[PDB]
Symmetry: C3
Subunit: 515 residues, 3 copies
């Protein structure tokens, strides 16, 4: 979209000579969209006196008369990359091993030279509280289990019936239990994310030459590169000078994951490669010092000194681990709901959308789908400008609402879940044209969706990736909620439009029954 165009006299005072020099250039300001990956528009600058701003006619090394300077602009796919900062490692699933010693002895002493669990060591020094804790059957439980049946739980399901082992309970040796903490061989590295940084590269293609026909005689293509890192560039010789000013505000802000911790499997039916097994967790799920129970990174001190530990069930204090959060999210997928810890809760179902990134192995970035119009200013030493835009018709070749990861299509669960709109369009023209995809005039209590733009090659089909997220703002269950999907060509004309119908199932809640 061209915003401003006109002539301007840019005078430059050379700082060494303090000397003035003025030229009248054409200053065009136009935006570049996120989904604008093809050369659909072109800027043509009328060039008088070609070659070396009229000519000396005619070895001779002179100049030619007239030709148009063609300029187009594309933008690489937009990503939101976060910088990583390592913090600490975490175990996939810490496991408690219960030992029932053969000689009915158990030692968890703090200065115990050799406990029945054994000491860990971070080097030559042994780690505190790594020796677990012991459990003995109380006199009250030996009394109950002998005559009747003890109603008090033991962590090792101890049998304290006197008849179960009379020859040793008589001599005071009661049944004992050892509870040691072990680590899964699978470790994870936890990196704290940073501030989001928009990353892209605008490609400015400039070609200078020697009813409906506009034939091109020999041109020489030159490509400029603009971006946040290099927000300006100039063409060969000194004709075109560009400058990236910045983007406009995004209508739907980025997800607030700046203060979360990215879990990456520490390397030593197969697991999927790259970031498929990655996770991104809030700090309320973690214990950095390891002194808290039922958190990622629970340590020895938390497991050894848990209150009434011998009276609790096995594996207590060891919940909420990376393996638990993973298995929990997989359950949410089977129920049409969105994961809460897997990084695919932003992609919408597939990990393939996150491998198109061009960063290093230890990097994280989400594909931006909101509108981010970057403003570029072109200043050419050529008076006369014209915009040439391709208009190709299109057709919506398919639209449907599907749950997370496409486990089932047609609808989702009202407020606990959300839907994902996959839209298939096809360029029916013979040229590469830009398109705008909008969802509007929905039924009641349906959340508005921001439009998306697709640059489709001629005769090719395209699809929204990642798809649009669809919510509903009530908890009822409707059989056919409606929305209108419209396909706009360039310069804002509707080439095709259909009505998208979907169901929402009612929401479900917890309940406790009192007695």
């Amino acid at each position: 979209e061209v915003i401003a165009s006109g002539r301007l006299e840019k005078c430059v005072v050379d700082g060494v000579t303090e000397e003035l020099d003025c030229q009248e250039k054409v200053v065009v300001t136009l935006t570049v969209g996120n989904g604008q990956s093809l050369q659909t528009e072109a800027l043509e600058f009328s060039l008088s006196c070609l070659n070396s701003d009229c000519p000396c006619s005619c070895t001779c090394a002179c100049r030619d008369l007239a030709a148009p300077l063609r300029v187009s602009l594309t933008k690489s796919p937009l990503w939101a990359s976060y910088p990583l900062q390592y913090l600490s490692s975490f175990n996939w699933k810490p496991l408690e091993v219960i030992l029932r010693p053969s000689n009915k002895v158990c030692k968890d002493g703090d200065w115990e030279d050799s406990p029945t669990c054994g000491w860990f060591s971070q080097g030559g020094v042994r780690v505190a509280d790594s020796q677990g804790f012991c459990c003995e059957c109380s006199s009250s439980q030996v009394w109950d289990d002998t005559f009747g049946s003890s109603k008090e739980r033991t962590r090792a399901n101890l049998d304290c019936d006197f008849w179960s082992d009379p020859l040793d309970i008589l001599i005071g040796r009661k049944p004992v239990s050892a509870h040691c903490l072990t680590f899964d061989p699978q470790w994870y590295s936890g990196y704290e994310l940073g501030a989001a940084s928009l990353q892209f590269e605008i490609a400015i293609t400039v070609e200078v030459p020697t009813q409906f026909l506009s034939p091109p005689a020999p041109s020489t293509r030159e490509v400029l590169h603009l971006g946040p890192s290099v927000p300006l560039a100039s063409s060969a010789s000194r004709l075109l000078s560009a400058k990236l000013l910045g983007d406009l505000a995004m209508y739907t802000q980025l997800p607030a994951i700046s203060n979360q911790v990215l879990m990456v499997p520490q390397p030593p039916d197969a697991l999927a490669t790259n970031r498929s097994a990655w996770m991104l967790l809030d700090k309320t799920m973690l214990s950095m010092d390891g002194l808290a129970c039922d958190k990622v990174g629970t340590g020895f001190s938390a497991f050894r000194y848990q209150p009434s530990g011998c009276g609790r069930a096995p594996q207590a204090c060891l919940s909420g681990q990376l393996k638990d959060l993973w298995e929990a999210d997989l359950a949410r997928i089977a129920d049409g709901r969105v994961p809460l810890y897997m990084i695919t809760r932003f992609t919408g179902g597939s990990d393939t959308t996150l491998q198109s990134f061009s960063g290093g192995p230890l990097s994280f970035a989400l594909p931006v789908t909101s509108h981010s119009q970057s403003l570029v200013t072109l200043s050419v030493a050529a008076d006369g400008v014209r915009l040439v835009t391709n208009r190709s018709p299109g057709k919506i070749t398919g639209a449907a609402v599907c749950r997370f990861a496409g486990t089932s299509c047609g609808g989702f669960e009202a407020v606990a879940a959300r839907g994902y709109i996959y839209v298939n369009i096809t360029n029916t023209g013979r040229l590469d044209s830009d398109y705008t995809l909008t969802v509007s005039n929905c039924s009641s209590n349906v959340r508005p969706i921001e439009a998306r733009t697709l640059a489709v090659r001629a005769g090719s089909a395209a699809s929204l990736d990642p798809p649009m997220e669809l919510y509903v703002e009530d908890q009822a269950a409707a059989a056919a909620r409606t929305c209108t999907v419209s396909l706009y060509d360039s310069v804002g004309a509707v080439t095709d439009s259909l009505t998208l119908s979907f169901y929402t199932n009612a929401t479900q809640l917890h309940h406790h029954h009192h007695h």
Copy 2:
């Protein structure tokens, strides 16, 4: 504000025929403000050869000569809506019931067939640790309470004096206590908020016809609608083609509530106010999702049963920090001129009425944006010649004062623990609907700068800032009269009125422990 205007030759290559077609249109780029709800400006495009871009003179079906094409733009009120995702339910106030059995027996066994508290059940299976815990008076406390007075607390205020019940303590039956967890009948649904999405709709009114006088002869009004969902539209026939490019960056960013949990009262199937008045928005550090933590929203049976030294602690221990507690705590902050920390009205500034003007569904949440969010719109008309017609009407500041949260008292606030709210009354004294800009500047020392606000006021009507401006001070001292200058600008940046706003700040207060 008009930004760019000029002529441009837009050539369109029809993709089916690969055929070129060029036209010279006027491309105007202008911004639309957040608080711009009235038609104060108008763009007039000189239209030669009316009707069907000169005419064939003269059934005839021909064209007329000349008239101006009038175009205006308004913007709906701006909101920041967050998508909800349900997580779990939470009880308004879990209550501990203390039982003192008549037969002095108490059973909290894990496999106990029938405990003195009873098992809950999530269906047909009974919930673990729902049977509470029992307490017995230790031998040490029976020894103290019999002769002197025991200094050790019991959760049930047990009387373990032997003389208080000798016939049963002698046969070993000591006084016992049962501590069961119960739930308030009022439940709450907790929805995790999502990413903020700016939502609005720009209304482009276009009317084509067919000293100071500019009379309108018959016009036909056509309204276009642009927004984030539909960022472009075209008029009837093919005269005007619009496109919404986006907004500019906001100077004061939105509140970071993306990862918080919205608490909504769960319906049952002196009265409370309707809609979101009873809603709350909490940080995840106030919650226990698994319920295995004490003194958090959603504390479960396992946390209450296995609390360390539970029988030695006071009643209702581990049951603090609940939805009822956080609510009653915020109400106390209101009575002390401070701002709530959990009620969603801590963003509105005092009144819930500002949040019911939203047009979303029953289960939605949105805050009214007050920062400048200037959206850029590009107009391209097939009519060469353009003119901007803006209404300028004078105004007067009819009132300005600093008030605490919810207007419990005006005149000032508490320095750093609290903040003030600036209510400003203005009145359009002209006969036309003009736009205005409201600024607070040239303040005294250590006063935080405030971003300006814009008000579109109907002719002869009075307007007011809603929600009011939030005012802070960057020191902890107590001043009797801090000053700021409130200025009212008409359109095209002229000061019609200005007054000096004076307010006091009380000194901040801090906690203190006296050791012994």
Copy 3:
């Protein structure tokens, strides 16, 4: 950068008379950069009929013929200020005092009239659980310490050997311990931060008068002031009318510190003044009610009722305090890593960059380094406009990568740490010109860096402050990673460029050795 310029007929209908009035003004829209603090560009408006829009020739009170109206724009340094909201106070380091009474008595009763620790008081009422807790040596430990050596830890390192004190253990008096909680005399005030607000002031200098030479005959300089608080202004009389529209989106977003708590030392080899001792903590490090252990603000109830408290080490439950987090971050500085709690983790090493702020004593703001181009619209009653920009060459006079606070330069630790790029440039011209500093064409797995702009006075040297943060997206250890640092003058020409080489050391991780 000038974006749009042209003529526009702005008609104004006076609301009182309903009367029309039209004038044709020049509407220039141009951006103002973040680092643009000098008058490098200038807008010159051709003014016909000077003095009072041709003249009446010739007391006379008439007008002159012709002169140019010079207009320049600068922007103050950009800051992101956060509003503070006080919450509660916190102690620098709560300390546990262990008492061993001479008479072997210990009382921690709830209704105890006078305990061996003593009651605190918030006024006239005494604070609950302020009397600490007592510890007695169990019969099991007296049995072990008498014959052999007890392997169970006591919090007071108690000696329960019967022979160590036989005359009192015989009469039942066992060794006892008192554990009271005390507070460091240094307190801290904790303020919850608010939403970030961009704060700046654009200075519009307008002076109206009355080969390379352009001499100035007497002008009168007038300065306008625009900003978020006052986004518009008009010149003396009614010539120029300005309006600040807003900034463009920032490419690298601000750090998400909105919901954190700022710790400020509560006033009564010396510490540096202002914010040098300040800290900014996540709410997961705090206990507001004080009922949690090993957190900032741990209270009496947490310390008194800690499970197995008498069996734990001294100072247990009292970790993770403001003194601990401070001493921990200082250790990260000595290891080339970035602090996690000190507010200097955003500045990059020096506190001097945070004292240039102009706020009150209780305020907090970070210097914005991302591009924030503000759009300003100028409308002058003078047809004819010209842009005069100074171009002075520059030279990169130094570039190096240094760890946090400059503890050592040359490189950093790959993912646990980050580097900081200090760049020295010098204006070699005789005029004040603007510059653009870019880092591009890096080696593999190097994170992209957004460009920065420097306004340098003539003949003066400038430096990046705060320096650019440099990350790497892999965990390997390389001896010489390369990037290209380029220096652009105004209107986008490369005056100087060098290649910046640096090393990255491999990352380090935790490890537990099992037994």
